Structures are given as C-alpha cells and as structure tokens.
Design a protein around this motif. Sequence first.
Motif, PDB file in Angstrom:
ATOM      1  N   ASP A   1     -67.789  30.422  52.591  1.00 58.56           N
ATOM      2  CA  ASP A   1     -68.549  29.184  52.671  1.00 58.56           C
ATOM      3  C   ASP A   1     -69.679  29.237  53.691  1.00 58.56           C
ATOM      4  OD1 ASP A   1     -67.524  28.009  55.396  1.00 58.56           O
ATOM      5  OD2 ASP A   1     -65.685  28.510  54.309  1.00 58.56           O
TER       6      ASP A   1
ATOM      7  N   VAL B   1     -72.530  32.038  45.406  1.00 56.52           N
ATOM      8  CA  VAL B   1     -71.640  31.153  44.673  1.00 56.52           C
ATOM      9  C   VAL B   1     -70.378  31.920  44.306  1.00 56.52           C
ATOM     10  CG1 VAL B   1     -71.357  29.889  42.516  1.00 56.52           C
ATOM     11  CG2 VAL B   1     -73.435  29.616  43.852  1.00 56.52           C
TER      12      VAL B   1
ATOM     13  N   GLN C   1     -75.768  29.277  47.196  1.00 54.78           N
ATOM     14  CA  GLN C   1     -75.157  28.039  47.656  1.00 54.78           C
ATOM     15  C   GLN C   1     -76.098  27.313  48.604  1.00 54.78           C
ATOM     16  OE1 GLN C   1     -70.320  29.003  47.302  1.00 54.78           O
ATOM     17  NE2 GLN C   1     -71.127  28.310  49.283  1.00 54.78           N
TER      18      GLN C   1
ATOM     19  N   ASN D   1     -68.048  22.672  47.076  1.00 55.08           N
ATOM     20  CA  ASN D   1     -69.270  22.001  47.499  1.00 55.08           C
ATOM     21  C   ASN D   1     -69.038  20.594  48.038  1.00 55.08           C
ATOM     22  OD1 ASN D   1     -71.474  23.990  46.197  1.00 55.08           O
ATOM     23  ND2 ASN D   1     -69.812  23.682  44.716  1.00 55.08           N
TER      24      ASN D   1
END
Lengths: 233, 108, 143, 162, 331, 54, 54, 63, 102, 154
Positions: free
Chosen positions: E192, E315, E328, J25
């Motif tokens: 992330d 991603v 991302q 997300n």
Amino acid sequence: DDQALISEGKDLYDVACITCHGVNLQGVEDRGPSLVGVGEGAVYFQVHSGRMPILRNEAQAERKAPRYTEAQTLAIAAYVAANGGGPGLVYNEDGTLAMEELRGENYDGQITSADVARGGDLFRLNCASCHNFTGRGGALSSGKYAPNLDAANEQEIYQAMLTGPQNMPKFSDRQLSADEKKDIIAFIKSTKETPSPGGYSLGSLGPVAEGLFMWVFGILVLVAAAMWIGSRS
Amino acid sequence: MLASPPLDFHLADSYFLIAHFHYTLFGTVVFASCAGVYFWFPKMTGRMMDERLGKIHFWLTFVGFHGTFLIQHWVGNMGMPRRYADYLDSDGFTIYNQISTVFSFLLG
Amino acid sequence: MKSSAKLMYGPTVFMAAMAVIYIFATMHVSDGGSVKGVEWVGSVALVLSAGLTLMLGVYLHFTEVRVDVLPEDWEEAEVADKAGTLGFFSPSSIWPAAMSGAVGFLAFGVVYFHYWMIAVGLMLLIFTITKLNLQYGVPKEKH
Amino acid sequence: LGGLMALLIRAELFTPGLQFLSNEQFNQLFTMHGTVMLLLYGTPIVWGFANYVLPLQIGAPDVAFPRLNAFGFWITTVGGVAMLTGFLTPGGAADFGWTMYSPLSDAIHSPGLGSDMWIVGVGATGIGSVASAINMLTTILCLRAPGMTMFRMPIFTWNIFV
Amino acid sequence: CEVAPPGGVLGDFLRMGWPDGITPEAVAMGNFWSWVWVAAWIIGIIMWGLFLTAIFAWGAKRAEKRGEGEFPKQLQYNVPLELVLTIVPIIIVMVLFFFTVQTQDKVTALDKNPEVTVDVTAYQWNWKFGYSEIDGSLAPGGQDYQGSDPERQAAAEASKKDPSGDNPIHGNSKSDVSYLEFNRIETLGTTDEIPVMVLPVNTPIEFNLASADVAHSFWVPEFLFKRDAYAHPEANKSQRVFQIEEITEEGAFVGRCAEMCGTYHAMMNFELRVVDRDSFAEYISFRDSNPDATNAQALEHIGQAPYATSTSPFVSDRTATRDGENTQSNA
Amino acid sequence: LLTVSGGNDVYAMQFHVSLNAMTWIGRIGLIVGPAIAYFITYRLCIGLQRSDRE
Amino acid sequence: VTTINAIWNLGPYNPSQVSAGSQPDVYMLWTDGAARVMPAWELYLGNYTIPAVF
Amino acid sequence: MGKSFALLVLGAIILAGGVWYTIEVGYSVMAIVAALIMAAGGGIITWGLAVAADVNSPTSHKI
Amino acid sequence: LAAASMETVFPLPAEMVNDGAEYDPAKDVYEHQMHSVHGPRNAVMLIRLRTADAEKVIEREGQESFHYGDYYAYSKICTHIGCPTSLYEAQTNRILCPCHQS
Amino acid sequence: CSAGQITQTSSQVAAVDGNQAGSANDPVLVRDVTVHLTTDGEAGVKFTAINQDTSHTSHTLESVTVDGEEVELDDAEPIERNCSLVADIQSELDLIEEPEVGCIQHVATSLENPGFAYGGVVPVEFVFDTGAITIDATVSAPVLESGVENREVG
Ligand code: HAS
Ligand code: HAS
Ligand code: HEC
Ligand code: HEC
Ligand code: FES
Ligand SMILES: [Ca+2]
C-alpha cells in the motif's frame, strides 16, 4: 510470558507476510486474505506444515520444508491471536501441545481398537470422500487435490479439521466433537502405522495399482517364461 | 564493456545485458547456423535452396533483429532491469519497449 | 596420434598455473568490495580440470610411444597404405532408443519420486544396456 | 517452440499493465525460453552439424561409436520433452530464470514439480551432449584418412575438437 | 575518471542513456564509460568500414570486369602483420585494464568515514530501512545516535539455536535471523505504500545490506551502482557493506531490485529521498521523539511529499490492471 | 485411453495433471490418438518389410 | 507377496459414502472411462427422458 | 525494379494502418494486435526491399 | 456448523429419537435409525455458506424459500448415476462427484 | 493455466464466519464482522476496524447497531492510521492478550438479543465521525475451547 512473545511474533510477521496480508492483517486485494480472527491454530497449521509463505499463486498451496521453527511458529501465532483470536491450539494437561495423547477418546498408552472402529466409520463418512479409504489422498477440480495424510502430526490433523485450510470444509468442535476428532486421529494413525497383512501394499490406491502391476509386469514375466520354453520361429 | 567491473556495477542484470547476449548468441548461433544450413544443403540433400527466398529471409531477420535489440541498450541504461513483468507509465521507457516489440514481431 | 597427444599440454599447464595463482590470490588479497579467504569451489574445479586434461594428455602420450608410423600421420602417404579392414561398425540397433526411453522413465520417476518408478527405471535401464552390449553375440536359435 | 515464448514475452511488455499474462506466467515464460533456446536448440544444433560434417571432413566412413551417437540423440530429445512437460502441471513449469539461483530453487522457495522437471530435463540433455562429445574426440584421434595429418584438417573440425 | 567526457551532443550520444549521477564515484564511472565508448566506436567504425569495403570494393564482378581473372593472389600467411595485429589488442585491453583497476578501486574502497549508516533488509517482496548509526552533528542528542533495538535484536540473537532442538546447519537453527539488524527507527515498505529512506546531502553514507529470504539486490540508477543482498552474508563470504563518499544534490530517486527473487520481483520498488542537511536533523528528532508517527507524517514535518513521488505502488488486483492504469493513487 | 480415463482420478492425484485436463485428454484423445497410432503403425510396418527386402 | 483388495479397511457398504479413488476392477476400467468421457447429452421428450448414460 | 514497388506500396499503407490504430487504442489487448499489424507492414516493406535486392544483384542467373 | 461447512443428514422421524432431554438409557432405537441410514436415496448434504457467498446465490424457479438463512440442503445422490457427491469444495463452492467427475 | 490472472488461491477469503467490507482503496475497513450469541444467551458484535486513510484523518467509532438496535461499547480510542480496534464480547475478549507493541486496542461489547436466529443474517451499521459503513453479518455461537467438549447423548 506471552506479552514478550508477541514482540518476536510482530518482528517475524513484518519481515515475511506483509506483502500478502498487510501490516494490520487486513489482507491485500488479490494477493492474500485477511487474517483477522483465524487464531493460533490456523497459523500453527499453515506455518508448521510449511504451507506458508506461498511464493506462487497456483491452483493450491503446497506442503514443503517449513520456513520457521516451532518457537517462531508459536510467536507468529501469538501475534495473530492478538488481532481477534479464534480457534486455539489443543494444549495437553501440562501445557505442551498435545501429541500422541489425541489418539482416541480412551487413550491410555496404546491405540484402543474400539476408538479405531468408530474413527474408521467417521473417516469413511466425512474425510474419505476427498482423501481415500486409508487417507492416501485424491483429486479435485481444476488442479486441486487432497493430500496424503501420512505427513501430518496429530496437532496438524486437529487444526486441519478445525480450520478448513483452503477447500477443506471446517469441522468445528460442535459438529465433530473432541471425542470424534480424537477417534479420527486414532484411525488415521492406525492405518498409517500398521503393516498390511497381505504383503506389499501397492500403495493401497485400489484397483488401479493392482491392475497396472499385473497387466504390465506380471504378464511380461510370463511371456518371458514362454519365450524361454518355446521358440522364435 | 560488461567485462570491466565499474561499468558492470550499473550494467549487470539489466536490459543492456539482454541486448549483449542476444547480439552474441543470435549472431553466433542463428545467423551462422543459417549460413551452415544454406552452405551444406547441397551436400546434405543433393538439392540447392531457393536463392530469392534466402535473401528475403536474411533481410527480414537482419532488420527485425537490429530493430528489436539495438534499442534495448537504451532501456537497460535508463534503468529497466531484466526479468521485469510489468512497469509503470511514469517510469519513462514505454516507447522504447513498443519499438522493440514491433520489430520483435517482425523477427517472428 | 603424436600431435594431439602433445598439444593437450598447454591447456592443462595453464589451468594448473591459474589454480595455484588463484588459491594464493584469494587467500591473501584483502581488497575492498570482497572478502578475504580461500574459496574451495572454483579452486577444486580448476585443479580437477587440469586433472582431466592431464589424464587425456598422459594417456595419449603413453599410448603413442607404442604405436607405429601410421599412414594418416605420414605427411606423404598414399591411398593404398590404408587398404584393408578399417574395423567393425554397428549397422543398426534399436537399443539406443530403448535405453533413452528407460533413462527417461527413471528421470520422471525421480521427478515425482515414486519409488516404484525409480526401481522399475533402474531395472529397465540395466536390461536395455545389457541388450545393447549383447547385440552381436546373442546365440543362434538352439534348434 | 522457444521463440514463440519469446514473442509472448514481448507482446506482454508492449505496454504497461498486465494485459493477458500474470507475474507467474511471465516468469515461467522467460525461464523456459532461455532454457530451451540455450540447451535444446544451441548445443544440439552444434552436435548435429558436427555429426554430419566432421566424418566427411576427416575422411572417415562413420563416427567412432555409432550406437552411442544414436543414444545421445534420443536422450537429448527425452530431456527436451521432460523439460517441456512442466507446462502440463497446473502450477506451470519452472519460474526461477535459466540460471536457477539459490536459495530461490530450495524446496522452501520453489515448490511444484515443474522446478524438478527442469533439473532432470537439463541433466538428460547434458549427458546427451557428453555422449556426442566422446565420439568427436575419439573419431579425430583414430579414423583420419591417409595423408590427412592433424594440421591438414579444416578449421571447423579443429573447433569441434576443442 | 578525473577527465570529463567530451560533452555536448557528442557526450549525450556517448552517454548514451546513463543518468548523470549524484555522487563522486558516479561521475567517475560515467567518465570512464564515456571514454570507453569513444574507443569502442573507433573500433566499430574502423571494422565496419572493412566489411563495407568487402561488400563494394572486393566484389568479384568488378575484378572480372577489370580482367583480374578467375582467382585472386592466393595469399595465406603474413606473419609480421599477424604478430602486429595480435599485439595491438593486447595493449588495448592492457591499458584499458589499468584505468579499470583505478576506477574500480576508488569505487569499492570502504574507508569513506560514514556519518550515517543505514541497515537495509530485503524480503519477499519489499524493503525495510532502519537507521543504524548517526553522527553527533545530525543526531538528536549531540552525541552519536545508535539505533539498535535491545529487546527485538535480543530475540534475533536468541533465534540462533534450541527451539527445543533441531540445530542442523553447523549447530544453528535453519531459521536463524541473528544476521538481521533490528532498529528502533524503521521505515517499513508495504504493497500500500512505497518505502522512502530519507538521507542528507553532502555526508559520507553507508549501506549495510541483508536479506530475510532469497537473494535480492539494491540498485539505485542514480548511484550507477548495485549490490547483491544475501541471507547470511558472512556465511556467503559476501561483502555486505558499501559506502558512498556523499550525495551531491537533493531530490527523489527511484531504486529497484535487480535480482530475480520470485513472483513479485517487478513490484519491489523503493525510493531514496535526499533532503537538506538541516532538515535531516529535524526528521530524525521527529522520528525519535514520537515513534508512533508514520514515515509520511515525518515527511510532512519536513514539508515535502508524504509519499514516494518517483514511483507509486502497483495495483494489487490481477484483473483491474488490463487497461494499463496499474498505478495506485496514493492521495 | 478408455482405461486411463477410467483411472484418471488416481492419475491426476499422483502425476499432478489437472482433473479437467485429464477428462478432456480422454475426450479429444479418443478421436485424435487413434489416428496418430494408425499413421505411425502403418509407416513402421512398411519400414520393417522394407528392411526385410533389403 | 502383494496385497490385493484389502477389504478390511474399506468398511461395509452403505449408500451414503464414497471414496475419491473408487474405480472398478482393472478389466472394467474401460467401461468406467466411457462414462467419464461422454459429454452429458440428454434428451427430454414430454413425459419421458433418455438419460445421458444411454 | 519489378514487383518491389507495389510490394512496398501495399506495405506502406498497412504499416500506416497499424501505427494509426496503435495511437488510437489505449493500453489494452488490442494494442498488441495493432503492434502485429504494424510489424506485418514492416515485414512487407522489407520483403519488397529484399526482392529488389535480388533483382539488383541476381545470383541464380538462369530461371 | 461454522461458515463454509458441510454435514450429511438423514431423515429422522420424531418417533425414533433417543437423544437430548428425552434420552432414555433403555430404549433401543438403533435398528430403525440404521435402517434409515441405509435407505438408498435419503442422504442430503446440508451446507452452511459464508455470508459473502450467500449474496451471489441464484435461486431456482419454485425453490425460492427452501433455504433457512445461510443453510442450504441439496440431495447427496448424484443426478448422473447416483454415486454420493460428497466432495464440497469450500471456496469454489462446487459440489463434486468422485465417480465420473461431475 | 492455473497460474493465470484468474487464480483459485487468489480469490479466497478467510475461513471465518465474519463478513468483511472495504477494498484496499477505502479509508477504513471492517474485518470479521459477526454477531455472536453464546449458548447462555448473551450476545454482541465481533469485528475489527482498521484505519488506512492515507490522509491520516484519525477516526473514532461513534456507534454500531444491529438491525437498528443498539450495541453497547465504551472506551473506544481514536484509530489513527495503521491501527486496529478489535471488538468482541467480554468473555471472548478475555481469552487473548492485548499487545504492548503495535497499535491494537481491545474493546468489549454487548447487545440485548431481540430474538436473532442462529444461522440467519442481519444488517450491521457502523458510523464513524467520517461516515457510515453497512454490512450484512451472520449470527453464530462463539468457538469452544478446542479439545474440551465431547459429544454427549443426554
Ligand atoms: C555465444 C554466446 C556469448 C558470447 C560469444 C559472449 C561473449 C562475451 N561475453 Fe557474454 N558476458 C560477458 C562478457 C563477454 C565477453 C568479454 C565476451 C567476449 O567473447 C567478447 C570478445 C569478442 C569480440 C568480438 C572482441 C572485439 C573484436 C576485435 C577484433 C577487437 C579486439 C578487442 C579489443 C581491441 C578490445 C576492445 C577495445 C575497446 C577499446 C573496448 C560478461 C562479463 O564480462 C557477462 C556477465 C555480465 C553480468 O554482470 O551478468 C556476460 C553475459 C553473458 C550471458 C549472461 C546470461 C545470464 O546472465 O543469464 C550470456 C548468455 C552470454 C553469452 C555470450 N557472451 N554472455
Ligand atoms: C540461442 C539463444 C537465444 C535466442 C536465439 C533467443 C531469441 C529471442 N530472444 Fe531471448 N529473450 C528475449 C527476446 C528474444 C526474442 C524476441 C527472440 C527471437 O529470436 C524470437 C523470434 C523467433 C522465433 C523463431 C519465434 C517465431 C515463431 C513463429 C513464427 C511460429 C510459432 C508456431 C509454430 C507452429 C512453429 C513451427 C513449428 C514447427 C515444428 C515447424 C527477451 C526480451 O525481449 C529476453 C529477456 C526478457 C526478460 O524480461 O527477461 C530474453 C531472454 C533470453 C535469455 C535469458 C532468460 C533468463 O534470463 O532466464 C536467454 C539465455 C535467451 C536466449 C536466446 N533468445 N533469451
Ligand atoms: C474435500 C472437500 C475434503 C474433505 C471432506 C476433508 N478434507 Fe482434509 N483436506 C482437503 C484439502 C483440499 C486439503 C489440502 C489443504 C491445503 O491447504 O493444502 C486437506 C488437508 C488435510 C490435512 C493436512 C494434510 C497434510 O499433509 O498437511 C489433514 C490432516 C486433513 N485434511 C484431514 C481431514 C480430515 C480428518 C477430514 C475428515 C474430518 C477431512 N480432512 C475432510 C480436502 C478435504
Ligand atoms: C504471499 C507472498 C504470502 C506470504 C508471505 C504468506 N502468505 Fe499466508 N496466505 C497467502 C495466500 C495466497 C493465502 C490464501 C491461500 C491459502 O493457502 O489459504 C494465504 C493464507 C493464509 C492463512 C489461511 C487463513 C485461513 O483463514 O485459514 C494463514 C493462517 C496465513 N496465510 C498466515 C500466514 C503467515 C502467518 C505468514 C507469515 C509468517 C504468511 N501467511 C505468509 C499468501 C502468503
Ligand atoms: S455418479 Fe456422479 S458423475 Fe457419475
Ligand atoms: Ca503489459
């Protein structure tokens, strides 16, 4: 004692598993599931048998040489347990993980054959459809398979039944109670550890092995004998 | 250039290496094996190969090869490592890969 | 076989000299960007590579001091010199393919590690090798 | 066969984003492209040209060991098919590059039988190459034509000897 | 080299795509590369010319039209010219090897006196940075900062043996991790978030590499240098420490893995962010004072981008990436 | 092919080929493999008798 | 020297239980394999049906 | 001389058909097919050049 | 049952039940219960799904209200030749028959 | 063929009763959300709220409800980035240790049972300061202490 164990658990978790499970065990979009609530038993099964880490997405994970030792496994399990708990390990009466004491409801020092009978009927009811009659394994759809049960210890068997690793259904301790689970362990170990009275077992795969043996090599040796006794012209 | 360590610290295991060993292998094996096939086809068969098809084959392989692999030196230098399956649009070496790919299909 | 027996002495001496040079070098040179200490992989390989070439050269020389002035080595030989029997050569044989298949079966056996595949592969392999070696000496059909 | 895998690699790297391959499939593709192109194309074509040309150049009727040569051919093809069998696995073939660096090739870090099939396919190929080499030395040493001293050989057979 | 390239369009062509570099030895490597390319171009053109001469000058139709006959002079041996042409490459590679030794030795020497040393851990598949020691000039305390975490590193040293006893590998457990350095100031890379190591300008810096899992490599293209990170580097007899004399200009620079490690080898990027020397003291004091704060919060405390601007995380979905938007949005 | 398709549950478990792939191998093979067998067998027999005549 | 059909570990028959490897004897595997490779073509005619195993 | 003109011209539009499509579609699977069309055009270009090479300098003189 | 779990159940009329609070130690119901187990066509797979997977169920026309929450109950007898299906893949959610791979 | 973009090992979720909401997300994720109802009748909501807002906008769980009915929970600290608020019934919460290293915090819960059925599914509505999250969750008993319970006939 557990409070300091959790620190080593975190240190090991940060250096291996984040890439699939996230720093906060939330999982990753397609790379690994969330580990909230799986508990000590799932981590112990997955790490001790060596299934984790998975270095390639596949039809199914593979057992292999484990990447961590026992104490490190329990440390990682403690860290994961701190995030929501879950099913737990079966600790024996002195506090060690139970091994050889799960072999039957009525275990004293040897496998009781009544437990073996009940566990045999239980295994045939539930487990033998995906594995086979004696737990030699079996095939599934699209490249998945049910492993041969000779590799696992008793704790791994119990946590496998409890957690339902990938495609195995869960068998909670109120569907199959502890007596039933321990009788299943007794039957598995009896079938594993007893020699076949009728000579070499041919793997106990059933008609296929016996067929292949005879219909190739048994007839081949007799046509060799015929060539010895006959003529080539 | 790959033999000297101080250049190899940057060049090692990049697309520069890819271009180098494809130059040496595709030259020494593919070009010269084709040369050997055309050379000894009479002795191996008792027949002679078509000259025109041979020239067509040579020019296709030559132009497709140099188009494919000469430009990979630059992506290797710019920073693309070998064995990379995916790369970002912001990295800055998408056009060079596109030029490589078209001439690679020509090689095919 | 004079020239080829003696031309092998260059590669073997070069490899031996490189082996000793390399052993001293890695055991003494404490250069930055590297770790001092003798490495056994590589040194063992160099000495036994020198061993291979030396075995070839010494056997060929030891043989060549016995042989005569063969016409293939005589710089002005005539085609009539080598008239006679050249030797025996196998016309045809199915057994190379058979034992290649046997080795393939054995290799697949160790891939999956099914013990019966390994055992049957070894049995089949020695069978095919034996049939290869007895091809031109099988007895005539005993009536 | 190997060049088709090469073209698939290039097609995937045409643009960013994984259009039709995954990471695993891409890894297996370059691994097997390198392995087959170096070990199943290059060395066998070398020994094929050697086997045809060298006896004609040195003026011999046949190679020193004919059945050993046939064994070399067949075992090389056996190794090739074993190497390529990894794709029939559900998890695919080997995925660690043609060099197979460790610990990545360890049992811990490379499960799946394709990783093993590579090892055997390469090995079967290697002995096939060795069986071809035993001939070419012994042939040049023992079956040269009359009047063909060692330094009247063509350069090609010198290179094959070395 | 101490001598700069030709420069201009000739230098750009000779570059030929190398980054300019941001360290002294990067400049040295670039200069050596440029002059080696000059010599290589000389050889390349001066032999392609001879092949072109064969294509156009030594043709058979020309000599037969000229009346030369069916065959040429049939020359075979010119021994003095052969010996001269043999001696020429000998001298070329010899004189090349001299400068190779020069530049290589000034690159690899471990005598640069680090002010900062960062322990780096490679793992499948991300980077974890940890500040190991900081000189008193940049450290919060005035005295030298030492970052080794006592409890967590004690766990590492205790992992060496006796998990109730297996100890197969030379008397140690197969899962030893005592070679990893655990520090209390750490930046942990995730799928992330791209990790960012913060470094100052104009200070000798040191990197101490290691790998939890399979072999990796640390490659910063702006250093024009890369080094392999191995598990148990002492056991491999691999040099796990390398020093840069300094970094000469601030900015954000991508750094990649250059060793085939596994499935997600392409996803293993990091960033190296070089910041003003006065701001590095603020950064380290902020991270030390309130350790619960993330790396992004410290970067905000500096007043620069909280996340890696050089490369965004990939991603992680295997279907969404088909349309080429595999990037991302960090914020 | 009929026999090994009957035993493909064991075959896929042991030799690690996907169970669907085994069923489709059986299906498509019961058409294709007989043709290949006929072709190879015919040519091999002709070669054998050619060796006899030779 | 070789065990064949070790019935003692199969248990008695009851219609609710089955094993993964449950093929018939070897000489019957062909007629098992046929049933494995038939592509499930089944006919429905009003009040009647021809199953896929015909 | 000969077919080389037309075999080039036929290619020059096909190549133009390829690259145009490449700059039309985004990053997608069809961009791969656009690359293939572009490379086919380039191949027919070189095919024209090679037949031209054969005509300029024949080396199989008698048909 | 836990989520993503399976159990084979048989018809158990109320008359032949000797468990729970009603348990009489001297009531011999074993014969009838075993006589119900051995019925050819009365073993049914009771499947408890995950909530995430119970969202994407497609109901058959007329079988709308048969489920009871997460619980579904299908017949264990295969519709091809009648082997017990019994191979419930917990993630792919495919009931599999080992006899001929339905 | 199994290692493609669509893969069986990649699509899997955890073998737990708890549903989950949120992509990679999304700012705040809820994992393992379940309605627990022990055999003794007491009930509550197990879940884990993980904060991953890249804006670093630390939240505080304002409330949770099951079918609109309240669930009691107290002493919920704000959840800054990369932190987990684990919530469960007190009896089950006592079984696991709070980690002194890491950001995790344990919080107890309880709700009056309005008559929920084992096996069924009920909506659960979370509301944090930054917004509301809705997710259906199943009703089930907590897990037994493994190995202690036997099948008892009567
Ligand atoms: C058939 C296949 C190949 C041939 C031939 C070949 C030739 C060379 N290679 Fe190579 N190569 C390397 C160096 C050389 C050198 C020095 C030569 C020589 O044969 C080159 C000599 C050839 C010439 C044609 C010389 C020029 C000609 C003339 C007439 C002038 C004489 C020379 C002068 C005057 C000196 C030059 C003067 C200057 C001023 C520069 C190195 C390292 O020094 C690496 C590893 C790098 C790394 O970090 O991984 C490497 C990597 C590879 C790999 C890596 C595969 C993998 O990583 O998985 C492969 C397959 C490969 C194949 C082949 N390579 N090579
Ligand atoms: C002898 C040695 C080699 C040759 C020749 C070779 C040819 C090519 N290579 Fe390569 N290769 C790459 C691209 C190409 C391309 C486009 C071709 C071309 O020659 C391919 C075109 C040629 C063909 C020949 C294929 C055309 C096929 C057609 C048109 C039809 C197929 C259908 C049928 C039915 C065939 C007919 C069948 C009958 C039976 C008649 C690239 C990148 O673009 C990489 C690095 C990628 C990465 O990220 O690591 C690479 C990687 C390697 C590696 C390192 C692998 C590793 O790191 O693990 C090695 C050793 C190697 C060797 C060799 N390679 N190559
Ligand atoms: C098919 C639906 C299954 C049933 C019914 C049972 N199990 Fe199973 N099991 C199955 C799979 C697909 C796997 C592999 C899981 C993985 O992640 O690899 C397993 C695994 C086990 C194991 C572990 C074996 C090992 O070598 O580690 C054990 C011990 C095990 N299963 C036991 C077991 C028992 C006792 C069952 C009946 C109660 C049972 N399983 C059912 C698939 C299936
Ligand atoms: C990717 C690089 C992984 C790493 C590193 C680790 N695991 Fe993993 N894990 C991964 C996948 C793809 C899956 C799903 C497939 C499967 O085999 O189940 C998993 C699953 C688990 C599970 C099972 C959860 C359950 O509900 O039963 C557990 C318990 C687990 N993973 C734990 C775990 C730990 C503790 C790891 C580091 C020590 C670890 N895994 C590594 C992928 C990856
Ligand atoms: S009995 Fe179920 S598929 Fe045939
Ligand atoms: Ca792409």
